[PDB]
Amino acid sequence: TIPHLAIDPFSLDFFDDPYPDQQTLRDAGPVVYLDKWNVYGVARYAEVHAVLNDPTTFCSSRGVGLSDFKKEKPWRPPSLILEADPPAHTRPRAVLSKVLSPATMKTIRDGFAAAADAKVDELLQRGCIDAIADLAEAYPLSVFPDAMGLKQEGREHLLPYAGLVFNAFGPPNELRQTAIERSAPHQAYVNEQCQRPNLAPGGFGACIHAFTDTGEITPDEAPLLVRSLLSAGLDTTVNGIGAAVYCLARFPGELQRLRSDPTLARNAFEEAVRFESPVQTFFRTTTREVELGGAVIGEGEKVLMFLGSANRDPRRWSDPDLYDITRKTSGHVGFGSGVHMCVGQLVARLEGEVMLSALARKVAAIDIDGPVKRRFNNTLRGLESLPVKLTPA
Numbered sequence: 389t390i391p392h393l394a395i396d397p398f399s400l401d402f403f404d405d406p407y408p409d410q411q412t413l414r415d416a417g418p419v420v421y422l423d424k425w426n427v428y429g430v431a432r433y434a435e436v437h438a439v440l441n442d443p444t445t446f447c448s449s450r451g452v453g454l455s456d457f458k459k460e461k462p463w464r465p466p467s468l469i470l471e472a473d474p475p476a477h478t479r480p481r482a483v484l485s486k487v488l489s490p491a492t493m494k495t496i497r498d499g500f501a502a503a504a505d506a507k508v509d510e511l512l513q514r515g516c517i518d519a520i521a522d523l524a525e526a527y528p529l530s531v532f533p534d535a536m537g538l539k540q541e542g543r544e545h546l547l548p549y550a551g552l553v554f555n556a557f558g559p560p561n562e563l564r565q566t567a568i569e570r571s572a573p574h575q576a577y578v579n580e581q582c583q584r585p586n587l588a589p590g591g592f593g594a595c596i597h598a599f600t601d602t603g604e605i606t607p608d609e610a611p612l613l614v615r616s617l618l619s620a621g622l623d624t625t626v627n628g629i630g631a632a633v634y635c636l637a638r639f640p641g642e643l644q645r646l647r648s649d650p651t652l653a654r655n656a657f658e659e660a661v662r663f664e665s666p667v668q669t670f671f672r673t674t675t676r677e678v679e680l681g682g683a684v685i686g687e688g689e690k691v692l693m694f695l696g697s698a699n700r701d702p703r704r705w706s707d708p709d710l711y712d713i714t715r716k717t718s719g720h721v722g723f724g725s726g727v728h729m730c731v732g733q734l735v736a737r738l739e740g741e742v743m744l745s746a747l748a749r750k751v752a753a754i755d756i757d758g759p760v761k762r763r764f765n766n767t768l769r770g771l772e773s774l775p776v777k778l779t780p781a
């Protein structure tokens with residue numbers, strides 16, 4: 389009944405160009421079985437959306453990577469939000485939602501915007517830059533660690549730690565095992581910065597620790613909630629902003645539309661998240677026998693959701709392989725969907741909006757002028773190097 393495929397969605401060949409294999413996964417059927425890793429896969433929008441929105445049947449507390457926490461020990465203590473189910477998920481999720489709230493965005497927006505404008509001005513003085521290291525990495529590094537309340541020393545651990553975390557959702561391939569082999573110094577730094585005395589007053593981390601007296605979380609839960617933000621809050625935005633710049637560099641007609649109406653910046657970033665899907669995949673684990681797309685899946689089975697493929701499913705999207713900054717993007721699953729939908733999405737969208745606004749107002753052209761190099765990760769899609777020439781407006 390269920391088609392069996394030999395595609396490895398975590399192989400370097402797949403990462404290098406995933407779109408043909410993603411169509412093969414979609415067109416084989418609503419539910420496939422991946423013989424390489426003994427998991428079920430869903431690559432169409434409908435089934436990915438359905439799985440995300442049934443957390444009772446497709447749970448997260450047995451891990452959202454390949455490893456099943458009921459069978460193997462997690463490589464680090466489980467996240468209290470990403471790797472939890474309702475009801476244990478509910479109150480930690482509420483705290484992070486209030487920490488990363490609209491009111492918090494109003495407090496930091498002017499600073500985030502000023503830093504975006506300053507970075508673009510700085511880059512325009514150089515002309516020829518690397519849009520990854522000098523922009524997609526440099527800008528989030530210039531705002532997010534400060535907004536967290538982190539000290540200056542040791543920030544070089546943040547991107548390596550996040551790369552490790554996202555590699556660790558993958559299967560035990562060389563990417564994952566090499567990441568874990570090098571993990572010790574990055575885990576040590578991150579776990580230490582999660583303690584209340586090491587988080588500056590007014591930042592996200594101090595606000596988490598201040599929310600430990602309402603009956604929603606206890607003081608011993610705050611370090612792991614800070615860890616969630618230090619795991620998921622930086623590398624994601626790096627690849628999201630990098631995706632947006634890569635899109636504008638490849639689709640100059642859309643850069644010209646953005647320049648003519650800078651208020652399109654927020655949707656231009658949202659469309660980049662759909663188009664590239666920086667977070668490509670997550671797993672769930674079935675808690676019972678379930679019918680999905682006419683197929684019967686037993687209890688305790690891993691289900692791999694192809695978020696990037698769902699975001700390019702022609703059953704759901706018109707011209708899915710086109711970057712369109714005025715597309716109605718509502719419903720894309722690049723931030724997930726349902727009870728686990730990205731709790732930091734307001735931060736991600738704020739960073740992306742103000743950076744694309746700075747580009748819209750200050751830059752006339754973005755031309756690739758060097759070899760493009762891809763960065764390989766079991767969960768994240770993005771570039772290692774994006775040489776571009778920026779022409780001032």
Ligand code: HEM
Pocket residue numbers: 448452469470471481484488616617620621622624625627628629661665666667670695721722723724725727728729730731732733735736
């Ligand atoms: C372009 C940027 C980002 C993308 C594409 C992204 C993607 C996602 C996705 C797909 C999920 C759902 C995970 C699941 O269903 O299992 C998620 C959840 C989450 N994200 Fe984001 N994210 C981004 C930025 C951020 C930022 C800036 C933060 C923090 C400041 C953050 C923190 C989190 C956390 C803690 C969760 C877990 C939420 C929960 O389980 O309830 N992310 N993200």
Ligand SMILES: COc1cccc(C(=O)O)c1
Pocket residue numbers: 467468469470471553554615616617619620667
């Ligand atoms: C996609 O959201 C993420 C990603 C990685 C880690 C976490 C966390 O809670 O530690 C969350």
Ligand SMILES: [Cl-]
Pocket residue numbers: 464575578579
């Ligand atoms: Cl850790």
